Design a protein around this nucleic acid. Structure first.
Ligand SMILES: *[C@@H]1O[C@H](CO)[C@@H](O[C@@H]2O[C@H](CO)[C@@H](O[C@@H]3O[C@H](CO[C@H]4O[C@H](CO)[C@@H](O)[C@H](O)[C@@H]4O[C@@H]4O[C@H](CO)[C@@H](O[C@@H]5O[C@H](CO[C@]6(C(=O)O)C[C@H](O)[C@@H](NC(C)=O)[C@H]([C@H](O)[C@H](O)CO)O6)[C@H](O)[C@H](O)[C@H]5O)[C@H](O)[C@H]4NC(C)=O)[C@@H](O)[C@H](O[C@H]4O[C@H](CO)[C@@H](O)[C@H](O)[C@@H]4O)[C@@H]3O)[C@H](O)[C@H]2NC(C)=O)[C@H](O)[C@H]1NC(C)=O
Ligand SMILES: *C[C@@](*)(O)[C@H](CCCNC(N)=[NH2+])NC(=O)[C@@H]1CCCN1C(=O)[C@H](N)Cc1ccccc1
Ligand SMILES: [K+]
Ligand code: NA
Lengths: 259, 33
DNA sequence: CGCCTAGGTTGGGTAGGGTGGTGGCG
């Protein structure tokens, strides 16, 4: 998260950390949608052009965290994965279209003050909340800057970061980049003239872009950190997987079996 | 199967449930106006 | 007892904390 700020305890209880077993490294963010389902980005698990292709046993997921590196005794909860489901039409060859994946835990997790699921949107939630100018919130333990080049400051936060950002008009998103945009994507962030700052960055992928319904007071996950070009650059906007456009697949998978 | 959690989704134990506002949600709400 | 900074699947923020039990020093 670039230009964000430390999260408050239990502010994003649906936040999940995708962690590699060996070597032990934080791979991505993810989100809790029930006691046994977690949502993340597909490229976090599968990205051939970079030799990436994990399987259930390679990973573990960590829920209820705040601190990036400490093991938070009696608070966090670690769960293995029973199954991984990458969207079947996830386009890793070109533009990360449908950059989404579902991960089923082996054993259902118990909720707590720090562990609680976010709601998935439906047609009305999307129509009412996904509009240019409305703001959503992104969270992650990703980079505080573009670490692939010399820059001042720390690379990783020590605590979960949070930043609020406005959704941007689709034509703007489109003209901001040469990568092909699809309806399964939306972009967000401040425009140069708005003088404000913020964006997601590497290591944040899979993390949720949530919005609060002013109508029922609940938090809905509208997007998933997918990609970008640099971090927090002027004229650039972070890109997010459009969750509601992929809702049919999601529900098809989650409700498929009686287990 | 979905499992537990749908009914109570999106309501945080340390915030909505205790009628407390995080420090920045206000900014969100105001963006809808 | 009041300080100080610390392993562990883990920092030092302090010996609780959003968590359990646990020093060494003056
Ligand atoms: C990223 O990395 C991953 C991880 O490595 C890599 O995965 C590899 O992908 C390769 C594709 O290029 C693939 O190759 C195959 O391998 C075949 C043999 O492997 C299978 O069997 C061995 C041991 O027998 C296992 O170790 C393997 O895991 C693999 O198991 C199969 O896995 C598939 C996909 O998950 C299963 O399909 C699913 O099946 C579901 C239903 O499951 C049951 C069921 O009905 O309940 C389970 C039952 O046990 C089973 N019954 C029996 C009697 O076995 C039935 C039954 O198969 C079917 O019902 C009848 O069709 O299935 C659902 O249907 C679900 O929708 C479906 O997706 C599959 O069931 C499972 N099989 C078994 C028996 O368990 C080779 O045979 C295969 O050969 C093919 O090509 C050859 C030509 O070159 C040709 O000779 C041959 O005839 C075939 O056409 C080919 O080599 C690898 O298997 C796979 N490796 C691993 C470890 O998974 C990714 O590709 C990589 N991705 C990228 C993008 O880089
Ligand atoms: C995997 C995620 O951590 C990461 C999120 C980046 C978010 N960035 C901003 N500014 N909000 N995604 C990536 O790193 C993806 C995966 C592969 C390359 N990539 C990029 O975002 C590239 N920088 C651009 C890109 C290349 C190919 C296809 C799509 C995008
Ligand atoms: K301790
Ligand atoms: Na920008």
């Amino acid at each position: 998260i670039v230009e964000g700020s430390d999260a408050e305890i239990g502010m994003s209880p649906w936040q999940v950390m995708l962690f590699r077993k060996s070597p032990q490294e934080l791979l991505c963010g993810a989100s809790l949608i029930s006691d046994r389902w977690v949502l993340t980005a597909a490229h976090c698990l599968l990205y051939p052009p970079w030799d990436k292709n994990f399987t259930e046993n390679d990973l573990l997921v960590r829920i209820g965290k705040h601190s990036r590196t400490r093991y938070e005794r009696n608070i966090e909860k670690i769960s293995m994965l029973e199954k991984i489901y990458i969207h079947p039409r996830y386009n890793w060859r070109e533009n990360l279209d449908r950059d989404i994946a579902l991960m089923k835990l082996k054993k259902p997790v118990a909720f707590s003050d720090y562990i609680h699921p976010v709601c998935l949107p439906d047609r009305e939630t999307a129509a009412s909340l996904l509009q240019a100018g409305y703001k959503g919130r992104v969270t992650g333990w990703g980079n505080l800057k573009e670490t692939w080049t010399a820059n001042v400051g720390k690379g990783q936060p020590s605590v979960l970061q949070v930043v609020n950002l406005p959704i941007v008009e689709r034509p703007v998103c489109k003209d901001s980049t040469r990568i092909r945009i699809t309806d399964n994507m939306f972009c967000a962030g401040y425009k140069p003239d708005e003088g404000k700052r913020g964006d997601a960055c590497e290591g944040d992928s899979g993390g949720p872009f949530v919005m609060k319904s002013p109508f029922n007071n609940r938090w809905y996950q509208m997007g998933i950190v997918s990609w970008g070009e640099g971090c927090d650059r002027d004229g650039k906007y972070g890109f997010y997987t459009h969750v509601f456009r992929l809702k049919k697949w999601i529900q098809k998978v989650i409700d498929q079996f009686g287990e | 199967t979905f499992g537990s959690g749908e009914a109570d989704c999106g309501l945080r134990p340390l915030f909505e449930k205790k009628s407390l506002e995080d420090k920045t949600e206000r900014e969100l709400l105001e963006s809808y106006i």
